Structures are given as C-alpha cells and as structure tokens.
Amino acid sequence: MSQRGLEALLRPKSIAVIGASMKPNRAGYLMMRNLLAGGFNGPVLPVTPAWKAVLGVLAWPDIASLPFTPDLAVLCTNASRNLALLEELGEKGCKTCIILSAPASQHEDLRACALRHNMRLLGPNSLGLLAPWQGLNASFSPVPIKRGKLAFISQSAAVSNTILDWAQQRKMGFSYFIALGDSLDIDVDELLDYLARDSKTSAILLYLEQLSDARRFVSAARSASRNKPILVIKSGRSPAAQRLLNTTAGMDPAWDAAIQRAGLLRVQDTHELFSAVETLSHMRPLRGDRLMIISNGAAPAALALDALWSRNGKLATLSEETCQKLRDALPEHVAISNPLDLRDDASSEHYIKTLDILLHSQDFDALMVIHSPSAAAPATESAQVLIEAVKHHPRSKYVSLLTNWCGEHSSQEARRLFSEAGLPTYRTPEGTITAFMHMVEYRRNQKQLRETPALPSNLTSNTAEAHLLLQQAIAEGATSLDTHEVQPILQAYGMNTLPTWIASDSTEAVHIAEQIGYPVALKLRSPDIPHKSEVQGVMLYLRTANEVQQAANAIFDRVKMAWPQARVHGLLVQSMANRAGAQELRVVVEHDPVFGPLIMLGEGGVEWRPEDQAVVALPPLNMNLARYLVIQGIKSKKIRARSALRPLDVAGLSQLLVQVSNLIVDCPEIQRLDIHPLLASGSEFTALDVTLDISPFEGDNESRLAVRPYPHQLEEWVELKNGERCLFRPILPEDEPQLQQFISRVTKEDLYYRYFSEINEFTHEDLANMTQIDYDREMAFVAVRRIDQTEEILGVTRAISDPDNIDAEFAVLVRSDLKGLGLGRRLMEKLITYTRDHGLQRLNGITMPNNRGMVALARKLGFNVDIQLEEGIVGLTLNLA
Amino acid sequence: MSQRGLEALLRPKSIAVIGASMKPNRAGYLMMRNLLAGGFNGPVLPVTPAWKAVLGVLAWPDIASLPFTPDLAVLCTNASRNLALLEELGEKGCKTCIILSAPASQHEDLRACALRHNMRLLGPNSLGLLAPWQGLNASFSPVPIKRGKLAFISQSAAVSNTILDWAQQRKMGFSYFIALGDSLDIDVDELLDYLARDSKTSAILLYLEQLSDARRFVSAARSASRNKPILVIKSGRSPAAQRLLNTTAGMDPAWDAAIQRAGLLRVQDTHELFSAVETLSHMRPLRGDRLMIISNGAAPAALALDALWSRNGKLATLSEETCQKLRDALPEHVAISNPLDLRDDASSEHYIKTLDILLHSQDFDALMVIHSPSAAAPATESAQVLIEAVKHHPRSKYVSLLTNWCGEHSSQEARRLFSEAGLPTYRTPEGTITAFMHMVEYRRNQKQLRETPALPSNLTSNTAEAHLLLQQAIAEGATSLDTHEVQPILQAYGMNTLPTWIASDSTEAVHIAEQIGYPVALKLRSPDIPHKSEVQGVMLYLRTANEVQQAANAIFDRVKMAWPQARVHGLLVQSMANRAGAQELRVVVEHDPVFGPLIMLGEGGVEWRPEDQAVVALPPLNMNLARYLVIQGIKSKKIRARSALRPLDVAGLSQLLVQVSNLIVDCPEIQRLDIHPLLASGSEFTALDVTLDISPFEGDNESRLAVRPYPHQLEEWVELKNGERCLFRPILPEDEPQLQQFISRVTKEDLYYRYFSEINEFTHEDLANMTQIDYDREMAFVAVRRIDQTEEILGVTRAISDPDNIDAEFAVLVRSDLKGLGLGRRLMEKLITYTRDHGLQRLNGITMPNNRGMVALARKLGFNVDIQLEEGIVGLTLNLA
Ligand SMILES: CC(=O)SCCNC(=O)CCNC(=O)[C@H](O)C(C)(C)COP(=O)(O)OP(=O)(O)OC[C@H]1O[C@@H](n2cnc3c(N)ncnc32)[C@H](O)[C@@H]1OP(=O)(O)O
C-alpha cells in the first residue's frame, strides 16, 4: 500500500541475484549480463553454490553470507525453492523481490509470507523492469533500451518485447518500463500514483487484460490524467479470446464506460498502438481542431480528406489576406485553396515559400505536409530544408506539425532526420489523420466532462416506502415482480406507468376490455418462467372481443397442455391504442462482477444485444452526464433523433435517467431492471412493461459502486451565538455560481491570506477544480442559508489527502463581513471530526506571520505552532486527526 | 474498339523520342536515360533541332528525316506544338503516340486528328508505361522496376510512384505497369480485354477515379475475372474530395453495386492496398475457409482471434488422432488446442515438430505462424528452419501458408528470406487476418453469384395498360402521381396497394370516415406544394367518432387555411393499414448519371440516408439476386428480421423486388419510384404511400442499363416437316435441370462429335457456364415444347464472339432420337440471321472428316469447306455471318 517501499524497487542502491550462472543458456546468466551492461552505480552481488565467480564477479555461497542487506533481490530458480528462499530473504532484511516462476496454487502462501516480513513482490512470471535514467536493466529481455520521457506498463511479455523492438527501430526511448506478470501484490493503481509525481515522465501508455480493484483504478487514473495524457489498449473482446486468456468473467462495455469516466481514451489495434507511441513521444499539444493540408499531388490528399470525413473532422478556411500566395509566390497554374495542391513538378523552394507564408498566419491549429517521390524534389533535400525552415521561424511554437513522406525505400534517411529533430512522421495519410483525431477526441472528452450541471427540477424520493414494499415482497419469497406490482415503487421516485388490471377468467377479461378500449393486450401471470420469450406469453393489438376470447382460451389451453403444473394467478389486461409512431426506447440495469451496476440505453422494438446497439454509463448520474449519454446515443446513430414526427426532448429523458440512477443507488435489493419499451411523446415519458429481480442484501451499500456517491449522512444543522441557523453540508458541482458570488464578496487582503498571493480572477477551470471533487480522496464543507428560494454561501473549508491516507492538507475561509460570529471554529471542528473518523493520522497547514487570527484559532484548537522568522513562515500540525 | 492496334503500344519494335535534350533537368533527358537503361532490343531515335547527338546517340533534325517509320512515339514538348507534331507523325505513318502535356480545351481537336489518321493515343498528362519482360521503360518515373507476374493500372501518377517504391523495398516485380492519364482514347476496358489473354499475367490490381462507359467495363471485368483474381480501390467518397477531383456527378453506392455485380472486390484504404499487393503476389489459392493458428505467446493470438471474430471467420477443430502432439516431445505444460500456444521459452525444434505433425493432417485449409522476439528462438534461424521444413514436406502444396514475424528491427533478414522463397509475410496479426478474409470473401461472392435460380410464379405484366395510363397522364401535363393515381399501374404488374375509391368534400370527409366508424386513409393534398412536411397527416389515434369529428374538422381548417394560391383538389377514400404491429420497409429507385437506374432497400426509419443505411443492386433481377440482396440486408444489421413479432418471409420479398424490377425495366417514362411504408405481415406485402415522377422519353430503352436484359423480341414459333410446332427462344439460367436431362439423352458418339473428346461428367460449374451468359457477347437458342406444364429441350445452338465483334465461333447439337426432321437447319438459319443483324463479319468452326452430316449441312448453307487430311481436321468459314 504505502508509496514508501516502492523506492527500493524503482531506485535501488544494491541488487542481489539468486541463481546466477556461467552457462550461456541460463536465465541467471542473461540477467547478470544485462545488469552488468546497464551502467549501474551500485554493486551487483551473485549468489550460488555452484560457482566461485560469475562473469568476473566474486560470488557468495548463500544468502546469509552476504556482507550486508541488499535493497532488491531476483529469484532465478525452480518454483519448488520459492518459499524457503523467501523466508531466508525475509530473515536477512530485504524488502523487495522479483520472482521468475510460480504455479497458481502457491499464491496464498506467498502472500502470507510476504505479509509476515513486510515485503513487496513484483508479480510472479514477470519479465522484469528497466529504468534508463538510473542505468538499471533488471530484466530477462533480449532487446536494449534508451532514455526518454514516455512510460509503459504491460501485462504481457511478448507485447513488451515487440514494443521495445519497435522503439529500437525508430531511435526512441523511455523513462520507465515495467512488466506486471500475475499482479499478485504490486498492481497498476500504485504505479499510476507513483508515476503521477515523477518529474521525468510526461505521458503514459498501458496494455491491460484484467483488473482486481475498480474504484482505486478509477480514482488513480482520474487523479493522474489531470496533468498528463494517458492511453490504453485492452484485448479479449471475443468469447474465444476470453477462453484463451481465462478472463470469461466481465463485460466489455463496462470497460468502455469505466475508461471514459476516468478521462482516458481507448485505442483499437496494434497499428494504432505504434501510432500512439509516435504521437505521445513527438507531437506538440493542440490548441484547437482546425487542419490545413498541402501536397505535391492530388490523390493522397483526396484519401486524407475521405479519412477525415469518416471521423467528423474540420477543415480550416484561408483568409483573404493570406491568399496572396497567388500574387507572386507561386506559379499561375496552382489553385489557391485548402488543400493546396502544388502539383507533381513542385520544387523545394515552393515548399519553403509556402511554409513561411502559412506560418506567418493564424488561420489553423495544425499543418499536414505530404511528399511523394519526384525528380524535381528529392526526399532528403526537401526534408532538410523543411527542418531548417521550421527551426528558424519565430511563430513555429504556436502550431503542431505532422509529416507524411510516402515511399518506403527512398524515405528512410528523411524519416531518420525527422526523428532526431523531434518532428512526428507517419507512413500513410490515413494513419496521420487517425493520429490527429485521437488527440482531438481526447481533448473533447476531457472538456465535456467538466461543464457546469444544472439543478434538477424534480426532487421526489420516498425511500422508506420503497424499502417497505420491497421488504414485503421478499418476505413472501417472491423473486421477481411485474408491472402491476412495480407501479407503486416507480411512482415513489416520480415515474409514471401505464395502468393495468387483473382478470381471473376470460369472462372478466372481456368485461373489462369492453369497459375500456377494445384494442388491448393480454398477458399471463407466469411466476415459473418470468421470461417473455420463453413461452411467448405477450400478444397485443386485439381489436375485437371475439379475438379476446379466442386468445385467452388459446393461452389457457397451451398452458395446461404445455406446462399445466405452473401456478396461475390470472391474466393482465391493458388498453393499447394504436401507437408506434411515438418513439420506443429500452433501458436496462445490470450488475457487473468487476465494475458493479451498469446503465444501458437503446432502441425498444428491435432485438437486444448491447455489444453493438447500446450506449453505457456508470452511476451516479447528474444532468450533465445524462445529457452526455443521450447526445452520444444520438451521434452514433444508435438512437434516431425525431424517429417519431415530434423531435425528441433531451431534457426530459435526462431527468428520467437521473431518477432511475437515484432509484438504483438507493435500493441495493434490486439486481436487475428492465423497461421494455419506454414511450417518448414530446415532454411525456411513460413505462409500458417493467420487470424487477430482487434478492436479500448484506453489506454497506456504498462499496458497491466504482465511484463514491454524495454522502448525504454528513448534513447537520448548527446554531450560532447570535441565534442564526444554517446548514453544513458537502459541496456540489451545482454550486459554481454561488461560489463565484462568494468569491466576489471577499476583500483583497483576505484573498492574499487564503491563497498566499494576489489573485485578480478565477476562470471556469479553477471553479470546476474547486467544485467537482472525488469524495474518496477529498472533502469540502460549505455553510449555507436560504433566502426566498435562493441559497447563499457563508464559508468553506477543505482537506486534501495523499493516496496512502496518512497526511492531509487543510484550509478555511469566511466571508469578510461575517467575521466574529464563530463560523470558523465550527467549520474547523467539523473538519477535524470527519478527518478523524475517516482514518487519517495528521493535518498540516502553512500560513504567514501577521495572520494573528488563524494562529490564535489554531492554538485554541490544540495545534502545534512553529514560527520560523527570517523566512516568514508559520507551520501548523495536529496529531490525532 | 480494335485489339489489333494495341500491339504497337505494348510490344513495339522501334521508338522515337520527340524533344530529347542534353540538359539534366529536362523531361526528354530523363525519358532517354530510362529507355537506354531499360534493356531494349530495338533502336531508340532522338529527334531535335538543338543537338547533333544525345547521350552518345546520333540525332535527326525533324520527323521527316527519319530513315523509316517508327512503331511508337513520345512527345516531350510544350502543348502548343501538339497538333502540328501529331499531323507530321500521321503523315509519316506512325500509329501510336504518348502525350506529356495538354489542356482540356484541346481534346476535340486531338480526337479529330487521331481519327483522321487511324492513330491511338495514351494520355494526355500520362506518366507512361513499363513492360519488364520486353526490357521497355518508356516513362518519366524515377523509380526502377523488376520482372514479375502482377499487372497494375492506375489513374494517378503519385500512387504509381508510391507503389513502385513499395515494390522496390520488398524485392517484388510486375508483368505490366500502365498509367492512363486523362483516358481520352485508350481506356480501362480495352486494357482488361488485352490482359485477360496475356500468358505472363496471373492477377490484376486497379486504382480508379471515374469511368465513361459502364456497360463495356462491366462486361470486360466479368469476362476477365473468370480465370484471374481482380481487386480495385476507388477514392473520392466525400464532397470535399469530389470537389478536389472534379467528380461530383457520381454516386458511390452505385460503384459498390457495379463492382459486386461484375465479380470483383473493393479494397478500403492504403494499408489494404499494400497487403493486397503482397497477397496477390505470393499466397497460394485457397481450397477452403478453415484456419489454424500457432504462436510463441498468448496475447498476439488473442488479438488475432478478436480480429477474426469481428469479421465472422471460422476456426478449425483438431481431430482426436492428431493428439500425437501430446506425445511428440511437446512439454507437459503445453495445452493441446487451437490456437496452440507454445510458450515464451519455445525453441525452433518445437516449431519444426509441430509443423510436421500438423502438415500430415487434413483438419484445416490455411495455417498462420506467429513469432515474437525471444532468446530461445532467434528470428533468422527459426525462419530458415521453417523454410526448409515447408520445402521438404510432401503435402505442403495442399494448404496455404501465412507468416507474421513481429519486431521491426530484428526481423528484416527473416522477411527478406521469406520473400525469396515465395512465402507471404505481414507486419501485424490483424493485417494477416484481414488479408486472409479478403480472399475468403472474394471466393464466397463468386460462388454466390452462380447458384441456380428458381422459376417465378408466372407473374402478370400488362405492359400495354401501364403504357396507356402513363401516356394519358403525361398528355395532361402531369409531372408526378400520388398513391390513388398509381394504384392501377402497380396492380397491372401484380402489386397490392391500399384501396382507392372516390369521395366528396370535407363535409363528406367525416361521413366517409364514419362509413366504417374507424380510422381510415383519406387524402387531402396540394399538387404544387414542393414538400410533404406540411401535411402532418397520419391516422394514429384518430379513432373515436368524437375524435373523428373534432380532429378531422380541425385538420381541414388548418390544412386549407395555409395557402390561397395553391390549386387544391378533392377527396377520395382509402382504408387503414396497421403499421405499428407490422414491420415497415422502404424501397426506392433512382437514376444514376453513370450506371443508370439503381434499386435501394432500407428499414424506413423516417430519416433516409442511403450512404449508410441501405443495400443496393443493379437491375434486371431474378429470384437468386433478389434473395442475395435481402440476405445481405439482414446480415449487415441494416434491416431486422425480428423488428416485428412475426418472422420475415424472404421469398415473398424477393418476388416483390422482382416485380418492381420488371416494372422499372419495361417503362422508361418513370424517373423515380418511392414506396415509403412498405408493410410486411408474413406472406402479405402491401404498399401504403407511393410516389412517381414521370417525363417524356425519346432514346433507346435497352441502352439505359449497365447489363443487357433478356431479349424478348427474338422469340419465334416454327413448325417442322411432320407438322409439330415448337418455340425457339434464348436460353435462361432457370433451364439448368432441363439441360441436364437433355444431355442425359445424348449418345456417346454424338457427344464425341460435339465436344471433340470423351466426357464422363458435367458438374454444376460447367452447366452454370452453359446457362448464365452475357447477352452482349454471347447468344444461344434452344428449341422447346410443352408437355403437361413441363418443358423439354430438343436442341441448342451457340455463337461466341470476340471483344472487337468481328469473328465468332459456332456450334450446334440435336437430341439423338430426333435427327432427320429439319431442326439443325432451322437452328443454323436463325443463328445466321441473328449474327448478321448483330453486325458480325465472319463465322468459324472445326470438326473431323468422319462427321459427314455436319459437312453436308455446311455445304448446303454455303460454307467454304477445307479438308486437311494427314491432320484429321476440317475447317469451315462463312464470310458474311
Ligand atoms: C516472463 C518471461 O518471459 S521470462 C523469459 C522467458 N523464459 C521463461 O519463461 C523460462 C523460465 N524458466 C526457466 O528458465 C527454467 O525453467 C527454470 C530456471 C525456472 C528452472 O530451471 P531448473 O533447472 O528447474 O532450475 P534450478 O532451480 O533447479 O537450478 C537453476 C540454477 O540455480 C542453482 N541453484 C540451485 N539451488 C540454489 C540455491 N539454493 N541458491 C541459489 N542457486 C541455486 C542451480 O545450480 C542452477 O544453476 P546451474 O545450472 O548453473 O548449476
């Protein structure tokens, strides 16, 4: 757990090799050779009973004979010695170990032994790790490595070797390269936490097959991706691959939803992985999504345009002033527009003139340069002149460059030169377009996740009634419920349903059917098989009573012949007037073994297969996320906009989805929910048929989800000295405008005291950072009071903890005109109580002398005060909270 | 046009270079250098007034000074000299010319000049052509070339150079390489006709941007692909690309349909083009679709499996006996199944043993071998041992091998070694799967096009009634017709429609609505209104008499208040059709400027965008092709078989599509047809709303289509000497079983006379060859008589022409027991009349001197008879066909 302890693995001062050997075909031999060639600054200690020296290095007979305690150890021996060697290492005092091989029946003993001695293990069957900046190569890989700024994490040795070979071809390096093996003790989330703070790393790439702890992964990825881009490839999308990899449990749309919610992006295949390596290594970050293209030929540009159109990209438009490329610069047979075709006989000088003129403008955000083989412009010379021209231009640092030099045999030297100058290069124009659109989409998703949500209109949630009804249902032994029984539960949360009636025989069915509209639907009450399709028990559109009697008798007869023993409660009759022009939708909620409950949206009438015709999301939902889900559904053509005559209403559907999310979050007894179909008619949404599967539950009900929901139990009413009453509660994303006003009503000196600097404005991004928090790692309380249905913020306090949950940093601020009423003390006391109950061990803060009020309050609250004059700093620390 | 005239271009004996020069930067200099370096067996003659010699070759001052007439000439000069130089060449007697440069305003004069002198032209704006086996490089390209068996045709210079460079990297060659430029005179269909007969060519690859004569292209590709595979890539799918290339007139789904109908396969992007080059060059033809996979790692195999699943491929299943693998030295920890994962520590010997055992079995049709970098199995050694093992195995020629060696830096030499031995190799597993599935799909499409159609249900086609009604409609200035007016026209061809009876004004609207007291289809329309969105009229929950009254009266008020100027019209009644319960479909027919009329099938989701939600086909259709269209629609998830509760009836939909095709083929006055709500309710299909746009026609009906339809006008009744009456008509694909019986009733000696050999079998493929013909290039007549609703064939004749339409080979055969009644003479006379009318010049045939009857009949018919004894052959020729 503790981030302390990974230091020995990633920055060791000494390493021991157990099983080093002189035989050239042995694993110990290869590991020793790699370590000696790495460039390490510490000692490498071989341990073996069969040799007095290995590759010129004096050896030691056994572990106990070592002159001192090694930082890191590697086992290169048969699995049958694992436990004894591990025990000896634990006795010696080593704290980190890499294990070459082990069967699956050994995991429990290994974990117990590691716990006994407080040792960390890198997954068994691991290839190893490489850290070029420390000159460390502790791996069994036959491929060399070079220094760089990209980090890679893999759960597969073959992929690791392949990527290393690709990097060798292109003269590119890394900052860290780690193989996880079986991930018994050390796992992906800890490494993400570590890499988020490494100064030499600027981007992260991952290949994954399975996970064990979803919430920690989501939180770590969300925290890490705030300042560095992260991409992921995940295999095993088909039944045969799942069987091959032994990962049959789980569902792939859940992976899609989880990856999207954390701010990452998924790549599809091997080619895109290589392109991602190139792009993350060399491309400059984007400032927009306008593209400009120039070429010495038409057809390659046409192919690029087709690729761009397939992905909904945007072409840049030239201005009238920039169009002076016609006047003198270029010959008269070149048409001036985007894309710019310089023709087959273009020379390098044309390229340079065009590049200069284009760079001195502001009409685009990225530039694509295409070159095909030609006599008038040899590849190497044109590449050299391009590199020089880009180097010497004053405004080159404002746009992103991309190069695509076609011709495999004649472009080798040009590509080599591009690599050493730090400019990205690609093999085909379609690949270039794909690489560009990847980053465009990444930025779009990150921006979309952070817009300000609106307040919800409806606020109805009668939790107690729903629990009461569900408890009564489970008491009798019921395991599923139908529309008639489910209507009150849905109504308790503000959802409408079509009325239905119960009939015990065909006579009553006919009586009620004629009492209502004759076009009706009949449904048997089947408690044995709840499946509609099994017996095909739903039939509809019966215009005449005679049809009703015939259908009822047919159902009864086929039941008594096919399956008489089943218990019969009667039929269900409902009027269905002719309506299909109203749009029909389907909503399903299911439980994933890995990520927990999942919400899916799709079309109603058609057959159900979520892998291809459904969009997904993780609860809990607010208005913004539900809107995002609906708009994704519309864009991907899986949901037809205005399928009915009336256009679809987005806001009402978002509200309904929010209500469904509330219901699912509140009641853990529900295992599955299905609305088939949901009728959309303007601003009216109604449920036609609905089913629920229920079961007893025993747990906390908060650890169920991958994202911690809003902690409603922390709300509390307080009374001040003057008698005023207010509410203390956690902060919400919807609070942004009121926070803007609150900041507006604070003086400059108080802002200087709070933020230790001068602040003239807070943008939307800072406010979003303040209001949209992860409740597992951060907490903030606000004090509010209501005036004529409008809230108002009086103060705020905050605490930010470390990933290990040991230390946290605190702050507090009160409105300038409400100083001496006791708000600060109450806020701080509530924060102290919460942090102590959460499991933290310390609070830390920093302020300056001449902030007398804060120092006095901290002394009143029991803090330890450290005034360091001559540096103008005061330290504050509180122990048991 | 004339296949004779291409010999000078493709196999010249001498060449003249107009405008050769000694300046290294001139085009003539480059052409001269290429030609002298190519290895030509003839003379190269430079013509220029500015040099006495060029690159050591004596020069001549002008064209008139040449010592003899050259076969081929090349123009390397400014476009302003084109016409004068061409006139001089025509005077000298040259018959072929390549033109470097010309603007679009010159085309008419160039065509006229070429026609005057009987000269063929390549280009203009053409890169040239290369023919390695003749040692000829007459082109302006800077990339070298090598001998091979693949041929390539391109409409783009940059793509040509890129492909040549790619081939240079991989050490592969070509048989012919030709660039078309503007295709003013020489075009694609003539080149396909020529390449179909070239002995050194075994496959063909094309890059295209536009066409000018669809009929000839389709026919030529159909003929050529019978014995050689052909792939195509076509760019310009988006409006921006179309604007860039000046090809906005066409429609891409028409290209899709045309490519499919001719038996070819379309490739998507640049990567697939490179893979296609590799596959056509090296892979052995498939005999099945079962795949086997082995690897030295799991994850690459899993990626392969995912790619295979996404394309609906088939995995092979091992037999129990092949469990020799468990014994044959594979370690105990390897699991025996497909894919077979030899572990990371696999050695070369394991590979060789597995390969031997697998090759000695019959469980699969293709084998994929994956290798990742490792210490135990170095790349080069493993490749060498694999090559030797494959070379020495007796059964290697029964399966197709594919290799995928990952790791760019370390596998260069291995890929080179694979190239020299003729084994295909690919960069990534996904690419390998894609390459395999391309050929699988190609074979599947070719097989599907040739199954036996079933006879139709003797549908009605009253052409006279439909023509009379359409002429009456146009006589009154009508430009479009609605459902009421088009009901009889649809009924004439056997298609059901909603009822069409008259009704009076709005006061009678409610009365006719209540005439049955339920919703029913009443139409109120404006004919001048461009759009139908104003109507907003659909009968859904306009049920109750109160509903009828109120809604209908309000609708009348709203509809009639809108527009005073519009010419309003009266009412007339139709009945309600249920569409909510039933499944809704859409059918549209449109006219394409290139390929002619097109038929589109869709789901009918209100929103209509054929580019992504429709399947397409070319008329005329029979039952087989219509079924193929429907099944394609179902497989792509564009139309649901289960949108309604009732399963979809394929046969009835096929029959309906055939009826629509008949209607469209018969009546050229129709420009567009739209059946928006086509209802399917099992075996019942009815049209709800339908529109027709009509216009006068003045051309030739048969020439509108890309495929010549069945020539019904050639049927004729004849009576024989004995008085029996029978029908002579062209052959049909539906005649296969009757032809089988007819062949069954012929004696062995007559079969020897007919086929000049002993034949003990006619498979389904030979019969398909006999019965499925292209009517523009082949004609066959059968004589049939009716017996109790069952037909029987008495004889058959055939004539197969050449693409130039000058010569044709003929044959005849009569049932053994019906000889001596006049059938042979009548069949031959009908054939002679038809061939003379078609425009052929000559008829040829061969037989043997013991066939007295044929010789006597040919003498009776006026043939010239030449008997060559000592060789056992008799030649027959008739001079005017
Ligand atoms: C994740 C990856 O891709 S790693 C690269 C791919 N390679 C692999 O997956 C294969 C890994 N496995 C192997 O190499 C082998 O199967 C092994 C090493 C696991 C087992 O080999 P074995 O012969 O069973 O090993 P064993 O433990 O008996 O002996 C290994 C060495 O340890 C030495 N040794 C024995 N006892 C001890 C001891 N107590 N302390 C130290 N060394 C010892 C033995 O002398 C032997 O050395 P030597 O051959 O020079 O005399």
Ligand SMILES: CC(=O)SCCNC(=O)CCNC(=O)[C@H](O)C(C)(C)COP(=O)(O)OP(=O)(O)OC[C@H]1O[C@@H](n2cnc3c(N)ncnc32)[C@H](O)[C@@H]1OP(=O)(O)O
């Ligand atoms: C953590 C960091 O990085 S430092 C940032 C701290 N925040 C700021 O400086 C923001 C600006 N200041 C403020 O917001 C407020 O002044 C705060 C938060 C410092 C204090 O909140 P307030 O509402 O003013 O305090 P409150 O009324 O609860 O006072 C509590 C105790 O402080 C004492 N106190 C407050 N100000 C002073 C003062 N200037 N001198 C002496 N005692 C003081 C009061 O006597 C009271 O004592 P008591 O409980 O024994 O009767």
Ligand SMILES: CC(=O)SCCNC(=O)CCNC(=O)[C@H](O)C(C)(C)COP(=O)(O)OP(=O)(O)OC[C@H]1O[C@@H](n2cnc3c(N)ncnc32)[C@H](O)[C@@H]1OP(=O)(O)O
């Ligand atoms: C895709 C490809 O084809 S590769 C890329 C090239 N693409 C292109 O479109 C072609 C590029 N364009 C060019 O090279 C130039 O524009 C050209 C060749 C078309 C015209 O150049 P111009 O200088 O106008 O040609 P012009 O006809 O005047 O002279 C060319 C040569 O013909 C010679 N010439 C002049 N009159 C005659 C004549 N009656 N007969 C023969 N030769 C003649 C001239 O001497 C000159 O030779 P020189 O340079 O050794 O003195």
Ligand SMILES: CC(=O)SCCNC(=O)CCNC(=O)[C@H](O)C(C)(C)COP(=O)(O)OP(=O)(O)OC[C@H]1O[C@@H](n2cnc3c(N)ncnc32)[C@H](O)[C@@H]1OP(=O)(O)O
């Ligand atoms: C076509 C090629 O390239 S060669 C392959 C030719 N095909 C065959 O040999 C297939 C086997 N034979 C047959 O199918 C038939 O016998 C055919 C096609 C040769 C003749 O067709 P038939 O129906 O027998 O001929 P039909 O009755 O029309 O006779 C036409 C004339 O031929 C004459 N004739 C036919 N057979 C003979 C014969 N063996 N000897 C002399 N005269 C003959 C008849 O007298 C008649 O003459 P007439 O018009 O002056 O009265």
